[PDB]
């Protein structure tokens, strides 16, 4: 502090690291898995989840039929993330250490 210990500023500001997140989030939605393996290729998100189910052994027909149900389960799941992180502050203790 006052004894000569210098705190060096980070190379990238909190804003820049947030832009990288926005780039990844925006990419996965429109481009699915393509942007990481090559040029950006737009794909409809409805078909993205369809082909992600075929990779785990689930026929895509489940999505189109249950798309309405999968819409409630997902949205309800994201809501629990906001309530958990807001209510429970110890989940980030790994970083606080």
């Amino acid at each position: 502090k006052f004894n000569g210990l210098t705190v060096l500023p980070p190379l990238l500001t909190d804003e820049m690291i947030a832009q990288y997140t926005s780039a990844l989030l925006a990419g996965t939605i429109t481009s699915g898995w393509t942007f990481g393996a090559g040029a950006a290729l737009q794909i409809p998100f409805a078909m993205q989840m369809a082909y992600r189910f075929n990779g785990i052994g689930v026929t895509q027909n489940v999505l189109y039929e249950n798309q309405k149900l999968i819409a409630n389960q997902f949205n309800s799941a994201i809501g629990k993330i906001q309530d958990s992180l807001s209510s429970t502050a110890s989940a980030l203790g790994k970083l606080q250490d």
Binding site: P10, Q19, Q42
Partner: protein
Amino acid sequence: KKFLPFQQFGRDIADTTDAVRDPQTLEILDITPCSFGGVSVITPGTNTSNQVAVLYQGVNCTEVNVFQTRAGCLIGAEHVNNSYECDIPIGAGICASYQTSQSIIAYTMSLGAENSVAYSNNSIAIPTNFTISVTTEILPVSMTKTSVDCTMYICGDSTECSNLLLQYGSFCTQLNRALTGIAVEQDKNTQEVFAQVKQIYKTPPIKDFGGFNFSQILPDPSKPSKRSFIEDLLFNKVTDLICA
């Protein structure tokens, strides 16, 4: 701040006084250490130019084209609004480079070109062509093996000096095993990586690759030491010093 009438001097969590009260007049005076920081020199390589830009950390411009940044005072550089790819890292998301009558400029580090992806219900992009690219990845494997002798190093050619080393016990005997263990680990890294099989396979005399040329990566028997054409450049590009 207000000190207690009976407490003249203050202290922080580190037991260092941050403020004091005038022994004569009654006042609260905070003690702020004098300005100090590291001296950073941002200059291009000697081959490019001799231009130099001094940078200060955690302090504004005091001593001293004098510009100020988030990391501190920066002298000898020019501020540019156009953001380009990072060259010389500085801090607070700022990079410096030597460009155009050329000097050193200070610009904000760019995250790369902007690319917008159009999204639509029926909009989909199916690649109509492909391109084969070969990426190179380099990783360290084995580290230079060095065995130091604490008996000769500590006391050179000295019997009396060495006698005092016995009073320290295993300190010398212990440091010898620490370095020996590192030398043994160096051999295990090459065996678990370089050779993944117990057999040696050689290419046939008649090589038909189906239109591909592997001669670059294939070993050349004409050379005295068998190696691939690519390995030859690696040995030369990677460099008495040990005699001393």
